[PDB]
Amino acid sequence: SDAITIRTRKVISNPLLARKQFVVDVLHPNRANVSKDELREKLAEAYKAEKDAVSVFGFRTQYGGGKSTGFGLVYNSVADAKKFEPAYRLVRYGLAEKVEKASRQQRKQRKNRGKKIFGTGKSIAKKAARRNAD
Amino acid sequence: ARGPKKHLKRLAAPHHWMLDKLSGCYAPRPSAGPHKLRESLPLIVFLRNRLKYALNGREVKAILMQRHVKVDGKVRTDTTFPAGFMDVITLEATNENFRLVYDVKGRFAVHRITDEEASYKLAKVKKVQLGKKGIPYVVTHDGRTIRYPDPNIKVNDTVKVDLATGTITDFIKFDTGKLVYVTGGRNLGRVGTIVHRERHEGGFDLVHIKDSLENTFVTRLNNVFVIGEPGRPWISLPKGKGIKLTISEERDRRRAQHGL
Amino acid sequence: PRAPRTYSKTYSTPKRPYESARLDAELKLAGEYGLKNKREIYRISFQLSKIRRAARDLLTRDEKDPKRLFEGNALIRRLVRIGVLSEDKKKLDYVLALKVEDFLERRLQTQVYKLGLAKSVHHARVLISQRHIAVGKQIVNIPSFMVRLESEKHIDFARTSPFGGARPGRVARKRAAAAGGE
RNA sequence: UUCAUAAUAACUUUUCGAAUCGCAUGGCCUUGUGCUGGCGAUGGUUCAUUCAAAUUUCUGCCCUAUCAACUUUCGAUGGUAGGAUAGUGGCCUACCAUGGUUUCAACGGGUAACGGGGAAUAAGGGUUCGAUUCCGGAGAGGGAGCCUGAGAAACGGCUACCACAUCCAAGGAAGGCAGCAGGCGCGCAAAUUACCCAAUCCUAAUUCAGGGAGGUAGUGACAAUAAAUAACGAUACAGGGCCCAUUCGGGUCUUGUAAUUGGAAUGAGUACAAUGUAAAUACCUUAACGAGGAACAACUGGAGGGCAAGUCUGGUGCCAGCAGCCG
RNA sequence: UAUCUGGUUGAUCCUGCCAGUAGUCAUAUGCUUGUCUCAAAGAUUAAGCCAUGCAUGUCUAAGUAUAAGCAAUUUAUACAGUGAAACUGCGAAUGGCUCAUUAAAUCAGUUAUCGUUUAUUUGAUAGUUCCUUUACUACAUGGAUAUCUGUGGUAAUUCUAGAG
Ligand SMILES: [Mg+2]
Ligand SMILES: [Mg+2]
Ligand SMILES: [Mg+2]
Ligand SMILES: [Mg+2]
Ligand SMILES: [Mg+2]
Ligand SMILES: [Mg+2]
Ligand SMILES: [Mg+2]
Ligand SMILES: [Mg+2]
Ligand SMILES: [Mg+2]
Ligand SMILES: [Mg+2]
Ligand SMILES: [Mg+2]
Ligand SMILES: [Mg+2]
Ligand SMILES: [Mg+2]
Ligand SMILES: [Mg+2]
Ligand SMILES: [Mg+2]
Ligand SMILES: [Mg+2]
Ligand SMILES: [Mg+2]
Ligand SMILES: [Mg+2]
Ligand SMILES: [Mg+2]
Ligand SMILES: [Mg+2]
Ligand SMILES: [Mg+2]
Ligand SMILES: [Mg+2]
Ligand SMILES: [Mg+2]
Ligand SMILES: [Mg+2]
Ligand SMILES: [Mg+2]
Ligand SMILES: [Mg+2]
Ligand SMILES: [Mg+2]
Ligand SMILES: [Mg+2]
Ligand SMILES: [Mg+2]
Ligand SMILES: [Mg+2]
Ligand SMILES: [Mg+2]
Ligand SMILES: [Mg+2]
Ligand SMILES: [Mg+2]
């Protein structure tokens, strides 16, 4: 009596982005939310596409449980999904990796420190070294 | 302010872009272009909001960059391009063609219009002058400068730009008893026939307009755009043809045409 | 700098706060319908005052005037859709004749009480507050859910609730577990 | 219109009129590096258009006469010519005229005055407020001066004076929070040195970079919305409609009061998860726990009148104190 | 959202104000405070003073590459890949904050520019640069200059002089 059933309302094709947009209306009694990955797979064999060219987000299990609503897109190919989707969705789905970024404060500090020096820091390092030498 | 202003706060955007007063502090300021920003329509608004083909700014940028939008036969890869009145937006994907004409509520409605007529465009003559070396030229409302026009084309008149070569194909002479469109004020989107054009020596011409429903109003001449001859419009008028049904008549339309 | 969204007051305390007859009437209406505070009666009176202000303003306007027709019948249809104004008196002059008790009667509280699935008004209040009644497979934990005429036929206990058919709940499940263990 | 434009004569320490980049590199055979040749990117004179910017017409401003005349040698009003201006203009100069405003309040003084869209208040007329989410204006400690540019009299641009300051090896150097944080001070009076470009957009050579603009969270009883703190039985102490009224009285019919007594339901909290989000909180959903004095305990004021509710008990006795007023 | 009440008197009818009453996107403050949504917030006095950290830099296939930076592998005898630095170009005059000055001043509505400047965006836009043309680089004219290589100075500052 689980029977998670899925529906795609307001579906619009879109070769502008080589996608198909829709709102995901998932009816699921006696159950919590649908754990996006599982619903991505459900849409994957629903629309005859791989589990990689399918994305869902913006979900909201309505008040009182049961129904839930989100937004979903199905891309014509996995490559188009790779080259059109935001980075954070490509990180959620495991098809990309979180970029090794220093924190914003450190980046700004380093930017100002680079501001202090005109041109490359090659000459100034040796100049300062031989300066404190004497 | 010392110099030009380059930010458009959301509340200050025109109520015809008719965006969401929440979900954003700013609104797309149209870059300089063929139309006044108050009268124009940025491409980002037309795609993200009017068409919903995109979702947000990045999607509109990606759409415009790959050269699928064609404004009047040209690519226009900038996000805030001011696609104004009577411009033609072509998407080779979905092979769809739109012409921007106000719906009678007074808004840039989505008007899917055929490919065959999408070849040309209409324009209002705003100036007729003599440029260098005695060369006559005509300035339309788009800012298009058509050189060597027909010798009896006058101001306030209308012309049919072929939009491929960008030259003059045919034109309509402004005078009484002529199908006409309105492009400003309370009478946005209204379509009618010119009954009289009172001169008013000293400025600010006025014209009286009577529509098919036999309703009558009056509008400024700067506000007026001849669109053809009665019964024979030169373009495909949008749904409703701008009759401006009364609020009670709109309610009766909602009640009568109703199927669920 | 973001465009504000407009909060607005929804009640108005009376100017004479200490009227014996009015206080007794307010307590009567609070006890009859299980109202938590007397701010509820103030809120219904404020809604009724707005309705009456609109009705009187439209009445002042001439008969057969587009404003009168349009907004008068709009208010009429809204009130009959709520159910407070009976279909017999859709005239906009019986709108001025509505009483606060009329809007009190259409609360989801009193409607659950009338249907009989709750045997007491306070029982209706608690049953609503315990996420049991669902107006069309959608629970409403709010007593002041103004039940409209088109949807009153769809009040019943929700499926997720034990009354609509589900697991009983904390106390019953614990007692059953204790009985099974011992 | 001396306009658009055209024409003649001339003038210029003579502006522009592509010595610039990417891709594809086709066709002609004059079969050679030969001849041509597409799509763009940057430029580029002029004229338009757009973003604008400057000025500009009429009308509209709070209090004050214990401010009645104000302005002109130093421009005050006008004329002419010139200079300067991007351009009109006493905008400045030279020479003339002696003019301009005013009891319909000019001029002066005050404003704990930025103007407005608006806010509170509400029978109608109005009164007060509007520093602040939008539009304008002004300012970057107070003042002046200026380079670059299309646009600045810029101040997260410079020069100097004044005020206030900083490092100092005493020779010098460097300052601008009424930006986001935060600190001192002030005062009755107002927040975390947090996360991030996800969303709105903006800038740039331009998708990609950047953005304390902005969004997200932190504090937040400024205000605003909905709303938990119990609900239902079965018992003992009771009350009203009673079959009549032999005293009765069954309680025949119901409604409360009792530390009696039972079974339910549920969150406020915790918490597997998943959703949410840039990532996280939080909300919506939901496992597993989570109510008996359901201690998971609701306060703030008042009980002479105005004004709902005590002439109950004890204490103090015109003290202590209460009292917006009468007391 | 058209309402009044207590107080001058032995008692009355008034004029009158004090007080009561209800607000307040008006704050401050006191006592309490469980939930969801939403949200103002160093304006009033001091436009008073500021430590510290950030708040504007920017590169596309397409301005400049000889980083003696990375890739050296399938594309590589000038160059092609990626790309620091610097020159060039553009923005830095937008945005954000505050209300100190300002009473026909700003501002609002409504006009005007036949009284002017306008990067940018968009649409068009030019044979003559020959000057006596029977002797010219147009199959491409010249010199510097940063970046860089090395020498320093000052206690230090986004201080930079000399050489190639
Ligand atoms: Mg600004
Ligand atoms: Mg001329
Ligand atoms: Mg002059
Ligand atoms: Mg003011
Ligand atoms: Mg002031
Ligand atoms: Mg203001
Ligand atoms: Mg002030
Ligand atoms: Mg402002
Ligand atoms: Mg300034
Ligand atoms: Mg200061
Ligand atoms: Mg510039
Ligand atoms: Mg300055
Ligand atoms: Mg600063
Ligand atoms: Mg600034
Ligand atoms: Mg500087
Ligand atoms: Mg600060
Ligand atoms: Mg901010
Ligand atoms: Mg405070
Ligand atoms: Mg808190
Ligand atoms: Mg409690
Ligand atoms: Mg008490
Ligand atoms: Mg007391
Ligand atoms: Mg007492
Ligand atoms: Mg009393
Ligand atoms: Mg009155
Ligand atoms: Mg007396
Ligand atoms: Mg007395
Ligand atoms: Mg008073
Ligand atoms: Mg909860
Ligand atoms: Mg202050
Ligand atoms: Mg630069
Ligand atoms: Mg490269
Ligand atoms: Mg004054």
PDB file of C-alpha atoms in Angstrom, chain B residues 116-202:
ATOM      1  CA  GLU B 116       5.169  33.886 -44.037  1.00  0.00           C
ATOM      2  CA  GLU B 117       4.223  37.313 -42.707  1.00  0.00           C
ATOM      3  CA  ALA B 118       7.116  37.255 -40.230  1.00  0.00           C
ATOM      4  CA  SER B 119       9.320  38.281 -43.162  1.00  0.00           C
ATOM      5  CA  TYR B 120       8.196  41.924 -42.920  1.00  0.00           C
ATOM      6  CA  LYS B 121       7.448  44.461 -40.200  1.00  0.00           C
ATOM      7  CA  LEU B 122       5.348  47.599 -39.774  1.00  0.00           C
ATOM      8  CA  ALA B 123       6.654  50.960 -38.597  1.00  0.00           C
ATOM      9  CA  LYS B 124       5.466  54.497 -37.868  1.00  0.00           C
ATOM     10  CA  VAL B 125       7.183  57.427 -39.549  1.00  0.00           C
ATOM     11  CA  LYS B 126       8.355  59.829 -36.851  1.00  0.00           C
ATOM     12  CA  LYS B 127      10.451  62.156 -39.006  1.00  0.00           C
ATOM     13  CA  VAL B 128      11.081  62.960 -42.662  1.00  0.00           C
ATOM     14  CA  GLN B 129      14.219  65.002 -43.248  1.00  0.00           C
ATOM     15  CA  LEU B 130      16.909  65.878 -45.783  1.00  0.00           C
ATOM     16  CA  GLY B 131      20.342  64.595 -44.805  1.00  0.00           C
ATOM     17  CA  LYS B 132      23.744  65.434 -46.259  1.00  0.00           C
ATOM     18  CA  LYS B 133      24.187  65.983 -50.013  1.00  0.00           C
ATOM     19  CA  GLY B 134      20.452  66.593 -50.302  1.00  0.00           C
ATOM     20  CA  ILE B 135      19.504  62.961 -49.642  1.00  0.00           C
ATOM     21  CA  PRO B 136      15.957  62.523 -48.289  1.00  0.00           C
ATOM     22  CA  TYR B 137      15.532  60.048 -45.457  1.00  0.00           C
ATOM     23  CA  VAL B 138      12.842  58.874 -43.055  1.00  0.00           C
ATOM     24  CA  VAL B 139      13.162  58.018 -39.358  1.00  0.00           C
ATOM     25  CA  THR B 140      10.697  55.463 -38.014  1.00  0.00           C
ATOM     26  CA  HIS B 141       9.780  54.763 -34.397  1.00  0.00           C
ATOM     27  CA  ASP B 142      12.415  52.018 -34.163  1.00  0.00           C
ATOM     28  CA  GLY B 143      15.091  54.558 -34.990  1.00  0.00           C
ATOM     29  CA  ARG B 144      15.542  52.859 -38.357  1.00  0.00           C
ATOM     30  CA  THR B 145      16.821  55.422 -40.860  1.00  0.00           C
ATOM     31  CA  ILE B 146      15.465  54.442 -44.274  1.00  0.00           C
ATOM     32  CA  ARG B 147      17.259  56.299 -47.056  1.00  0.00           C
ATOM     33  CA  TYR B 148      15.585  57.385 -50.306  1.00  0.00           C
ATOM     34  CA  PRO B 149      11.904  56.988 -49.362  1.00  0.00           C
ATOM     35  CA  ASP B 150       8.827  57.585 -51.473  1.00  0.00           C
ATOM     36  CA  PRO B 151       8.581  61.342 -52.171  1.00  0.00           C
ATOM     37  CA  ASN B 152       5.044  61.732 -50.764  1.00  0.00           C
ATOM     38  CA  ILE B 153       5.649  59.856 -47.500  1.00  0.00           C
ATOM     39  CA  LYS B 154       4.951  62.298 -44.668  1.00  0.00           C
ATOM     40  CA  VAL B 155       5.231  62.341 -40.883  1.00  0.00           C
ATOM     41  CA  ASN B 156       2.899  60.238 -38.694  1.00  0.00           C
ATOM     42  CA  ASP B 157       2.485  57.943 -41.703  1.00  0.00           C
ATOM     43  CA  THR B 158       3.102  54.199 -41.683  1.00  0.00           C
ATOM     44  CA  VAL B 159       5.439  51.994 -43.678  1.00  0.00           C
ATOM     45  CA  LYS B 160       5.982  48.281 -44.299  1.00  0.00           C
ATOM     46  CA  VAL B 161       9.671  47.463 -43.916  1.00  0.00           C
ATOM     47  CA  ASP B 162      10.627  44.233 -45.663  1.00  0.00           C
ATOM     48  CA  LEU B 163      12.909  43.480 -42.677  1.00  0.00           C
ATOM     49  CA  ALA B 164      15.277  41.474 -44.897  1.00  0.00           C
ATOM     50  CA  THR B 165      16.790  44.193 -47.075  1.00  0.00           C
ATOM     51  CA  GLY B 166      15.503  46.852 -44.684  1.00  0.00           C
ATOM     52  CA  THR B 167      13.977  49.005 -47.417  1.00  0.00           C
ATOM     53  CA  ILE B 168      10.517  50.403 -48.039  1.00  0.00           C
ATOM     54  CA  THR B 169       7.979  48.000 -49.540  1.00  0.00           C
ATOM     55  CA  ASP B 170       4.643  49.803 -49.168  1.00  0.00           C
ATOM     56  CA  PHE B 171       3.131  52.528 -47.028  1.00  0.00           C
ATOM     57  CA  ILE B 172      -0.183  53.804 -45.687  1.00  0.00           C
ATOM     58  CA  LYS B 173      -1.125  57.478 -45.635  1.00  0.00           C
ATOM     59  CA  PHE B 174      -2.576  58.934 -42.445  1.00  0.00           C
ATOM     60  CA  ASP B 175      -6.120  60.289 -42.902  1.00  0.00           C
ATOM     61  CA  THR B 176      -9.688  59.839 -41.684  1.00  0.00           C
ATOM     62  CA  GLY B 177     -11.426  56.489 -41.961  1.00  0.00           C
ATOM     63  CA  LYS B 178      -8.406  54.243 -41.469  1.00  0.00           C
ATOM     64  CA  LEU B 179      -7.710  51.305 -39.174  1.00  0.00           C
ATOM     65  CA  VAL B 180      -5.465  52.344 -36.308  1.00  0.00           C
ATOM     66  CA  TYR B 181      -3.712  51.101 -33.158  1.00  0.00           C
ATOM     67  CA  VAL B 182      -2.968  52.962 -29.921  1.00  0.00           C
ATOM     68  CA  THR B 183       0.396  52.791 -28.147  1.00  0.00           C
ATOM     69  CA  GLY B 184       0.116  54.792 -24.917  1.00  0.00           C
ATOM     70  CA  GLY B 185      -2.102  55.830 -22.025  1.00  0.00           C
ATOM     71  CA  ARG B 186      -5.416  54.389 -20.926  1.00  0.00           C
ATOM     72  CA  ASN B 187      -6.207  53.311 -24.494  1.00  0.00           C
ATOM     73  CA  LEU B 188      -3.334  50.818 -24.762  1.00  0.00           C
ATOM     74  CA  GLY B 189      -4.077  48.011 -27.182  1.00  0.00           C
ATOM     75  CA  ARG B 190      -7.238  49.625 -28.501  1.00  0.00           C
ATOM     76  CA  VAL B 191      -7.872  49.314 -32.236  1.00  0.00           C
ATOM     77  CA  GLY B 192     -10.292  51.459 -34.170  1.00  0.00           C
ATOM     78  CA  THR B 193     -10.901  53.835 -37.050  1.00  0.00           C
ATOM     79  CA  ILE B 194      -9.941  57.501 -37.245  1.00  0.00           C
ATOM     80  CA  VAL B 195     -13.134  59.566 -37.235  1.00  0.00           C
ATOM     81  CA  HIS B 196     -11.584  63.027 -36.899  1.00  0.00           C
ATOM     82  CA  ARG B 197      -8.168  64.583 -36.233  1.00  0.00           C
ATOM     83  CA  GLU B 198      -8.551  67.983 -34.592  1.00  0.00           C
ATOM     84  CA  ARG B 199      -5.527  70.130 -35.401  1.00  0.00           C
ATOM     85  CA  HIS B 200      -4.969  72.360 -32.334  1.00  0.00           C
ATOM     86  CA  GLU B 201      -2.597  74.964 -33.720  1.00  0.00           C
ATOM     87  CA  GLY B 202       0.373  75.207 -31.385  1.00  0.00           C
TER      88      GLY B 202
END
